[PDB]
């Protein structure tokens, strides 16, 4: 929340997302890179 002369965290949602198998093989192990996006199933929903 951006108030006048101050900013405050209304919330901080912190999650740990698994890296998909194809990203571990093709990106991390082959090129040493990760996608900047996290696409995973959390709480029976696909979240990106």
């Amino acid at each position: 929340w951006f108030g006048h002369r101050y900013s405050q965290f209304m919330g901080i949602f912190e999650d740990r997302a698994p890296v998909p198998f194809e990203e571990v093989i093709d990106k991390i192990n082959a090129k040493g890179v990760c996608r900047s996006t996290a696409k995973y199933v959390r709480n029976n929903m696909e979240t990106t």
Partner: protein
């Protein structure tokens, strides 16, 4: 035949010499070092209702 003459008898041991003294036996320290601290913080709670 003759009788065997007296044998050389064994000798009692001299006996272990002992030094008297005072002792302190020390062991490896496994107890953590302990001290007193004070934590100053603030519980911040933002409730969205």
């Amino acid at each position: 035949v003759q009788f065997e003459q007296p044998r050389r008898c064994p000798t009692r041991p001299e006996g272990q010499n002992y030094t008297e003294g005072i002792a302190v036996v020390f062991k490896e320290n496994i107890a953590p070092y302990k001290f007193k601290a004070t934590m100053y913080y603030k519980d911040v709670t933002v409730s969205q209702v």
